[PDB]
Design a protein around this ligand. Structure first.
Ligand SMILES: Cc1cn([C@H]2C[C@H](O)[C@@H](COP(=O)(O)OP(=O)(O)O)O2)c(=O)[nH]c1=O
Ligand SMILES: Cc1cn([C@H]2C[C@H](O)[C@@H](COP(=O)(O)OP(=O)(O)O)O2)c(=O)[nH]c1=O
Ligand SMILES: Cc1cn([C@H]2C[C@H](O)[C@@H](COP(=O)(O)OP(=O)(O)O)O2)c(=O)[nH]c1=O
Ligand SMILES: Cc1cn([C@H]2C[C@H](O)[C@@H](COP(=O)(O)OP(=O)(O)O)O2)c(=O)[nH]c1=O
Ligand SMILES: Cc1cn([C@H]2C[C@H](O)[C@@H](COP(=O)(O)OP(=O)(O)O)O2)c(=O)[nH]c1=O
Ligand SMILES: Cc1cn([C@H]2C[C@H](O)[C@@H](COP(=O)(O)OP(=O)(O)O)O2)c(=O)[nH]c1=O
Ligand SMILES: [Mg+2]
Ligand SMILES: [Mg+2]
Ligand SMILES: [Mg+2]
Ligand SMILES: [Mg+2]
Ligand SMILES: [Mg+2]
Ligand SMILES: [Mg+2]
Lengths: 133, 132, 132, 132, 133, 132
């Protein structure tokens, strides 16, 4: 059919603010299924830098890494019809009410969640967090 | 500009236990229930009539099969700008914040139907609530 | 031990926009809707019959007046241990966690009615859904 | 980045018991309460100053009467880009996902007020919290 | 009728954990109305000690005061039928799911909310937080 | 005061999409996730060890098959009095306010498992997280 898989990361601020179930629930209610899930008490900076390698040239690149390893994170692989962009739309941004970041986040860096933005990004990101491909 | 529109809560809503969730979103936008019917299984006739305008489409038959594969609730809602607002509340599976935007993810199994114009509203209401 | 019980959603539920909230609590406990009717204003006859056992009480007349001062929904729910469980779900205005425990605060305006025994269930269902 | 904006929870919010619901959406977006006051009935001169930029509109008088028809809560929220962000949260009755889009459906009884600019924010805050 | 007024205090841990609306919403949904409300960025230890004067002899008395002034608090006066005990039952304790403390709290001291436990306590507590009686 | 207990989110939880709902109730009670694992299908020997104290019961085999009929999540929660508190949160299908009381209605498909003692907690955690 139109089956797809995408990679989501629940960020440290999510645990800090007790919004983990809240975020996962929004994705769950949109009818997406967990295919793989891993809890990281503290992720290796290595994986983070690979995950954000495309951003290695930006000014915010190192502070973002500091943050991404400042607390726990959960890497999840969701599956569903048109999953990559639907979950991306669900993630939204801090300016659009109705989405996860729009309702719960308010910072350029501490935005609670990451979602693959394309097929190439997904395949690559999933490989990073679930090497046992 | 007070109006009345027709809403159908689809089988997938019962399957996934989202009936109250959906009705609650409409109720909280302050629209009232004027009439309502519960159908364990809707008569295929009614369904075909409801989607008459689609009889020529390729998705017609399967859609009917689905619309009868479970219970459905027919509801007539009243309120200011009801048709337009409930339609907007229904949304689509792309934009978060709406019923379909937050809970649906299929082009066919989209939980709810809402009239899209004054004309279809009057017609749809007559189909499910002939007693008028 | 599959059963069917009758539930009435009272006027105060429509007044306070808690209809979906209440139906959602029952739906989430996994009980299904077997039949349902919406009444803009319930016929006083039905109400008097429903509360027959109370005809001698001092609160009878006022209760009837209230039960007809707004819309009400009659619902027949099915499920394992339905009568007992939905009754427990209905609770009372003292114990938090139940429908009345979290949302009601009056001895008369308590949002919902649920049969309390196998006998009253069969009788109550016959009153609102004679077509049996 | 830090800003402070003034929000007013309107009479209809108390009537419909949506006060916690509204304040909750702002709290979940991570904004903090700096100041807050509950008015069982706000002094009319305060309301008129608050809407002074509207003093020549046809709806001015009626709106002020509505704002004085019940309690209201004035709150000073602090947070990054607070003015713009809380303004978008409020939205309008045509935008699902926002406060007015999900819970309001009237041109006047629209549950909430939020400053629309830095000047209006500064002016409005001094109106409800002159003690600074 | 059976009209009553009671005094509720939203505690510092409530703001810390962003549970203020949540708590007030549970009381709001049970059909109780706010008659007076005051926001304290930091309450004067004086009022706290008066509020808990009956506990002045307990070991936990000073730490509880330290906490009660460690952050903001909101004093509210609710009104409704049988308000004092109904709101008291709503408050519940950390061992009873279904109540505010039962669902959201988990400590002997940081328990999110205070509710008058009797008519005498209410009248006295209300006087403490709303002297303009 | 600090304890650590083992929780299992059962297959029915994924089937009924109640995973976030269940985990949310534990998260809102202030318990923290220490360890967590998702199993699309848990190895049967793990389930049998987990319920080894039940190995002689008539329901043993059927329960194990149910526990292997879908994904499950094993979590180690840490918090003050975690074992007892999370146990009460789980409750039973007769107790409104708890997880099973609000969402479950079966003797076997009861959505969640939580250690009932310090020894069982210690044993259970080593079964799902032997890497310690
Ligand atoms: C733009 C930006 C991003 N970041 C971090 C957090 C962002 O989620 C991450 C990726 O940036 P980006 O791709 O711009 O946003 P999204 O995550 O919405 O695609 O980099 C900052 O820390 N500061 C910034 O200014
Ligand atoms: C377009 C389309 C519709 N349908 C069914 C389900 C749609 O809800 C129903 C009506 O279609 P439509 O009128 O295009 O959308 P809405 O219901 O948003 O106005 O027809 C399909 O089964 N497959 C399709 O490709
Ligand atoms: C006891 C009582 C009941 N009533 C009305 C509303 C009650 O829901 C209805 C039925 O009473 P009852 O059977 O005692 O309670 P339940 O509905 O919990 O079984 O009668 C009053 O109006 N005043 C009263 O004092
Ligand atoms: C435009 C308009 C506003 N009002 C009232 C309610 C509006 O919230 C208030 C302020 O007007 P306005 O600034 O247009 O709306 P907002 O509050 O979205 O900026 O005036 C009316 O009563 N009638 C009207 O036609
Ligand atoms: C019993 C106790 C109370 N306290 C503080 C917080 C309690 O909410 C407050 C009042 O105690 P108490 O009357 O026992 O509980 P409640 O507040 O449920 O009536 O004193 C402690 O700090 N430690 C304790 O051991
Ligand atoms: C008692 C019982 C349990 N079970 C299954 C589901 C129970 O959750 C599991 C463990 O039994 P038990 O310890 O009695 O329940 P809990 O999980 O509340 O401690 O065994 C059955 O399938 N049939 C039964 O009759
Ligand atoms: Mg990106
Ligand atoms: Mg259409
Ligand atoms: Mg009775
Ligand atoms: Mg304005
Ligand atoms: Mg006390
Ligand atoms: Mg057990």
């Amino acid at each position: 059919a139109g089956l797809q898989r995408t990679l989501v990361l629940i960020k440290p601020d999510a645990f800090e603010r007790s919004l983990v179930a809240e975020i996962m629930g929004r994705i769950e209610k949109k009818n997406f299924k967990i295919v793989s899930m891993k809890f990281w008490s503290k992720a290796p900076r290595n994986l983070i830098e690979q995950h954000y390698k495309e951003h290695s040239e930006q000014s915010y690149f190192n502070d973002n890494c500091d943050f991404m390893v400042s607390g726990p994170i959960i890497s999840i692989v969701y599956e569903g019809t048109d999953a990559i962009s639907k979950i991306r739309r669900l993630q939204g941004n801090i300016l659009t009410p109705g989405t996860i970041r729009g309702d719960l986040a308010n910072d350029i860096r501490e935005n609670l969640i990451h979602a693959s933005d394309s097929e190439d990004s997904a395949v690559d990101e999933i490989s990073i967090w679930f090497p046992e491909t």
